Structure formats: C-alpha cells, structure tokens
Design a binder for these strands. Structure first.
Ligand SMILES: [Mg+2]
Ligand SMILES: [Mg+2]
Ligand SMILES: [Mg+2]
Ligand SMILES: [Mg+2]
Ligand SMILES: [Mg+2]
Ligand SMILES: [Mg+2]
Ligand SMILES: [Mg+2]
Ligand SMILES: [Mg+2]
Lengths: 119, 146, 227
RNA sequence: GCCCGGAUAGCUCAGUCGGUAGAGCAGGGGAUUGAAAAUCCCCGUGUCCUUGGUUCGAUUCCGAGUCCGGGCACCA
RNA sequence: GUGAGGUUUU
RNA sequence: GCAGCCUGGUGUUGGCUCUUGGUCGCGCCUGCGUAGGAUAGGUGGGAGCCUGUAAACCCCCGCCUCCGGGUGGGGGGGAGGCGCCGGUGAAAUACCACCCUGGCGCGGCUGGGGGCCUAACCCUCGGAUGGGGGGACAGCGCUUGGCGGGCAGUUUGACUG
C-alpha cells in the first residue's frame, strides 16, 4: 500500500485498554495492536511497563510507513493515559498540536450500574 | 451463424464479413431493426451480385447522412420548454422534446436515441450519436426549463 | 550471482530447444571454464513421493574406468584386518581411536569405511555427522560382500550413488572437465538406466522429469531422457 | 466396500501444527483460621489405538487396518 | 488520582 | 413410485463492465524456534571465481519482509570482499540452481458473485403496431439429485392341549 507521512491520530485510553491508531486526514486507521498480543487479560495493560507494545507497536509497524506527527485525540479518560501517550509524544515521534476530543457522556438515562454507586 | 451486416455495429468487425454471433443477439437486436440479415445462398449471393448498386446506396444513406451537424444543435438556440413548473414534475425523455423543436425553431429529429440511457429529471449537456460508422456526435445544451 | 562469467556465453542455455542428444551432453569442456579438478555432477530425477511407507530410495553402482577419484577413506584397524602382506594394504592410519564428539568433528567427509558390522549396536552412534545427508554406512548400501577387501577396492575407482531426501537434487560423479563421449558411453548409458532399474514399489507418475547435465562452471543444458 | 476426521491413568480431559507433558475423586495426616468449612499443600493409577518408516529422538509426524461414528453405495 | 476470592459462633 | 416443492446443466435467453477460479512455471525471488558472524530452504559440484567489459567499511536501489535485512538496473569508487577447516548442527554456503514455500505479469476455458442497458419474455395503461415497470430473472420443456403418507400398489411367516 501507499505509505503515509502526514496526518492525525486516534487514541483510546479507557480503564481496561490503552491503544492508539494513527490515521490520515480523512480518518482511515493504518494499524492496531493490543496487550493481548502478549496475552494481557483483564486489566494488566494500564500505565508503566508491560504494554507500550500496543501503541509503540502501532507506531513500530507504522515505522515502515514513516509517519510525521500524531495529533492527539483521547477517547476514554483516566487509568494512566499520561505516560502511555507521552511515550509516543517525545520518544521518537514528532507532534504538531495538542487539541484533544474528550468524550462527554450524558446518555439521558443510566448505562450499566457500575457508575451509579458513586454519583 | 451466417449473418450479414449493413452498417458497423460498433464491434464485431466490418460490414459484410462472415462473422459469428449469438442467435439471441442477432435474432432480436439485429433482424427486426433492419441492420443484419440471415445469409442463405441468396443473401450470401446478393452482396457480390451488387457491389456498386447498393454500396452507392450506403454512400448515399451514410455519406449523405453524416453531414447533419449543421443547423441542428451546434449553433446557439433557445430550446423551447414547458411553462414553469419550477420543480420538474414530468421528466424530459427522448420523445417529449422534438415536438417542441418542431413547433419552435423548426428542427425535426427522429426522436429516437435522444436519450440512450437514463431519461433524467435534470438538465445539462448531451451528445447525439447519429450512427453511420458512428461519427462525432452533435451536442445539445439544455439550459433552462421555465 | 549474475556476475562476470555468466554474461559471457549465456546463449547456450537456450530454453526453447527442440531435440538435443549429444550437443547438450558432451559440451562441458569449454562452456564450463574450469581451472581446477571439477566434478561434472550429472543430474537426473527419480519421481517418488517421500511421505509414505514402503518407499525407500537407495542406489549404489560402480564404474571400472577409474573416474580420476581415489578412495580417501579413514581406515580404523581392528581384528581381522591384515592379510599377511597382501601387497595392496595397510596404507592409511591404523588406530588413534577417534571419539571426537568434543569440538564436533572436522566436517570434511568424502568417503567413510566401517568394517566390523556392528550396526545393530552402533546404529545412530557411528553416523553422527551424517544424519539427513547420509554418507554413513548402511545395510542397504550393498557394500557387504564375501571378503573384507572389496570395499576399499571399489570406493577406489567406483562406488557412486544416487539417493535423495524429499526432492531430486541428485548427482553423478564420474569425469573430470575433459571427459569424452567415450566416457559418456558408460556414464549416461548405465547410470540413467540404473536409476530406472533401481525403483521403489510406489513409483507412479512421470518418473523421469528433470535430468540436467549441468556443471559447476557452466550452463544448464537439457537432453532427451534416453541417450 | 472407496473417501472423511481419532481412540491418552476407576472416570474423562490439559496435547503436536517433529526437540513438551497431566491436572481433579472412596485416600491418610497436614502453615493455615484462636482447635470450625476447606479455600489451599504432598498425593494411588501414560503399550498417548496394534504395528512399519524421514528422524537426535517419539510423550506428538507419516502407511495398512483390528478400535467407534456421519455421509456414500452395494448386497445375487 | 486508591485498595476485598474473603468467612462462620465457643 | 407419483402429484407437488427445492436445486445443477441446457433451450427460450441478449449486449457490456468489475474483481475473483481451474490443469495453470514462460517469470518473479520467496526460507530468521534456531543453539555461533546471518534473508541459515534441504543439499550437488566446494579452491575456484566477485574482478579493471568497474571493488570494498556501506553508501546505489525497484523487489518482498517475520523489520533484522538480502537478492536485480549498477551511474562516482579502485586489489580489495572470504569462504572449503575452525564456527553452528538434525545441515557448511561464497561458483553452476533440482523442485517445495510465495507475492505475482499470462498462454487454455471466463466456473461462480455483483453493477448498468434491454429489444426476447412477463405484468400493466383511456381508443394498445403506442407508453411505464420488472428484465435475461420469472414461467414453460428435457435431464440430474434430494425432500415428499398428500396420494397409489403393497407386505406384516409358521409350530402352538
Ligand atoms: Mg465473624
Ligand atoms: Mg430447471
Ligand atoms: Mg436493472
Ligand atoms: Mg420490447
Ligand atoms: Mg424496461
Ligand atoms: Mg432460467
Ligand atoms: Mg398406505
Ligand atoms: Mg393386487
């Protein structure tokens, strides 16, 4: 396929998983990995050592394509997004701007009752 | 299948050769339209029995017919349409325009093959493939329906 | 690989030949520019399937002309070795009891001799260097005769073999760079039909497909399978 | 009868895509928990279908079938 | 921004 | 067995287009669990040839990639790359390729699945040799296999306090 250099990127940083996927300026992903490629089950794929072979593998199987920047978009907050994204921010990949799309859930009525014990 | 052509059918070779083609094509698309003929020993005798007396009729009915790009659509003319009716209620077809061009501007057309596919609601440019070994089509430009 | 020597006379490959018998068999002298003792290594093909039982390729045949190739075996002297000054024996070493498993041998094998016939106990113990390529002595090799002095005398000027594993990468070491069709008159006369007489019972198919007489210094020419 | 996938410890099962191997019971006592349940620990049971062969081997690959099944015939 | 396979009354 | 239903082939039944399929090797350059120096396929020659008809630390570079990296056009290099042994092991290359493992251009027929037109065919419109829609599908014939008590012809033995 045609390798791409410029473009934006998408970031998933939920409680159970932290995986990025680098896109084009049209919104087409280029790869995805996980912590399940080692076999990280449950919540063993959070913030400080075992699984930046998800996002850094998402830039490392994209290293053969050679992307320029990763414009950050974070869907799903908490659970240690900071060092997992900042591994890709300043240890090999350039960035253009920091304009984040934080998800703002309302849903009208309730989702699954895990949140409602602490409202 | 011995079929003889009278005009080039855009494929399948030239006129008068011994060409093979499906009977579903030649039987329904070529024979009732008057373009290809079943070739027996009679119709296979006729094309060499007349090599000038009918090829001159192809020169007349084709070389005389390939000059009708003069006063039909290339010159600028206001095409007569119906009264508005801002949004098109009845879409324009190949049939419903030559009586307008027959009332105003005096241009008489077939009116077949003025829409080879998709009789469409909208308006724009369109080419009229008049087909002696088909040549360059004349261009109509519908601009307004008011 | 596509260097200086292949760009010279690559026209003689000719992948659209019609029928060649002699002019693609004898032309190994100067189409193969060799300044050394080369082996012509005549190819062939035995058509079998290597993934079933009752199917064991093995072939050993001799050639009494001389081959330009000596015996060069590693003789180990044991009981019943000498023949009381038989005038053609006791030339190589007679001992040293090599147990060279440490530093894993010396990996330059040309011919292996083994006299005592103890293969039921030394099986997969003496054939340590040659497992899959298999220049180890075997009971199916046919080198078991009446007396002892018939193995060295046949490896000397003889004992060529055809046996393959999973493919047909086969060879026939007979001549030097300058051998004539008077030597092809016992090479391609008896070897290509020796691999047709020697045959496993599961032979079904083409059975003679890719027989190239190609060299180390020259191109790949093709003859008809009978010549 | 041609072809299709397999027979692993009283019970059944973790298997290999050729260099590995078994966990559970009627069982005895066992850090535990302040002497209570057993959460948890040693532990009684491999011709890995019968046999032949590339193979450093076979606890695993391939060939005939004796072991059981579905489709497919065929049965004077 | 964070924590429980979790217990029984002598 | 039949009625009826489903379904492949074929006639009615055509015009195009897209990517896929099969005997398909003329061609591309695909092998890294790997224990040492590794783009290390099993092996065949294995002391010659890469080489001044333009080398080497690695800079040309399409090619694929498991991301390490090797093999072709070589435009500017300028006698240096270093292997048979040691080293790895179930196997020793660098010179000539035997087919498997594969991304792939095409020689034979397009086999199937889609998108458009449509005159055949079908439905429909007041006064219908003309308009609209479906559209080579449906229906119908032959042939092939299956379902099929809805139906028909049938069998369901003998000894016997
Ligand atoms: Mg309590
Ligand atoms: Mg039918
Ligand atoms: Mg349509
Ligand atoms: Mg019609
Ligand atoms: Mg229509
Ligand atoms: Mg039909
Ligand atoms: Mg009945
Ligand atoms: Mg009756």
């Amino acid at each position: 396929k045609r390798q791409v250099a410029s473009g934006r990127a998408y970031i998933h940083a939920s409680y159970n998983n932290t995986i990025v996927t680098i896109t084009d300026p049209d919104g087409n992903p280029i790869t995805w990995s996980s912590g399940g490629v080692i076999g990280y089950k449950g919540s063993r794929k959070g913030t400080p050592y075992a699984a930046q072979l998800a996002a850094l593998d998402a830039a490392k199987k994209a290293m053969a394509y050679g992307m320029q920047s990763v414009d950050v978009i974070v869907r799903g907050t908490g659970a240690g997004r900071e060092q997992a994204i900042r591994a890709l921010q300043a240890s090999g990949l350039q960035v253009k701007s920091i304009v984040d799309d934080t998800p703002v859930p309302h849903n009208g009525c309730r989702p699954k009752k895990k949140f409602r014990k602490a409202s | 299948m011995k079929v003889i052509l009278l005009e080039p059918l855009e494929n399948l070779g030239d006129v008068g050769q011994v060409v093979d083609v499906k009977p579903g094509y030649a039987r329904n698309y070529l024979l009732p339209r008057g373009l290809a003929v079943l070739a027996t020993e009679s119709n296979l005798k006729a094309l060499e029995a007349r090599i000038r007396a009918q090829a001159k009729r192809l020169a007349e009915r084709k070389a005389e017919a390939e000059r009708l790009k003069e006063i039909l659509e290339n010159l600028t003319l206001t095409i007569p349409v119906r009264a508005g009716e801002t949004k098109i209620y009845g879409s324009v077809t190949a049939k419903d325009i030559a009586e307008a061009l027959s009332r105003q501007h005096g241009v008489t057309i077939d009116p077949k093959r003025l829409a080879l596919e998709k009789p469409i609601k909208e308006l724009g440019e369109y080419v009229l493939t008049y087909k002696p070994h088909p040549e360059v089509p004349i261009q109509l430009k519908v601009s307004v329906v008011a | 690989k596509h260097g200086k020597r292949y760009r010279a006379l690559l026209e003689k490959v000719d992948p659209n030949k019609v029928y060649t018998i002699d002019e693609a068999a004898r032309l190994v002298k100067e189409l193969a520019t060799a300044k050394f003792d080369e082996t012509v290594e005549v190819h062939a093909k035995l058509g079998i399937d290597p993934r079933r039982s009752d199917q064991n390729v093995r072939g050993t045949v001799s050639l009494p002309h001389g081959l330009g190739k000596q015996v060069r075996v590693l003789a180990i002297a044991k009981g019943e070795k000498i023949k009381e000054a038989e005038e053609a024996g006791a030339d190589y070493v007679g001992g040293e009891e090599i147990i060279q498993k440490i530093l894993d041998g010396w990996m330059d094998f040309d011919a292996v001799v083994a006299t005592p016939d103890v293969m039921g106990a030394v099986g997969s113990k003496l054939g340590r260097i040659l497992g899959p390529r298999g220049l180890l002595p075997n009971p199916k090799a046919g080198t078991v005769g009446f007396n002892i002095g018939e193995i060295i005398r046949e490896i000397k000027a003889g004992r060529i073999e055809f046996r393959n594993d999973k493919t047909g990468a086969i060879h026939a070491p007979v001549g030097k760079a300058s051998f004539p069709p008077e030597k092809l008159a016992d090479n391609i006369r008896a070897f290509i039909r020796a691999l047709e007489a020697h045959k496993p019972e599961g032979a079904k198919g083409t059975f003679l497909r890719s027989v190239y007489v190609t060299t180390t210094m020259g191109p790949s020419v093709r003859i008809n399978p009978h010549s």
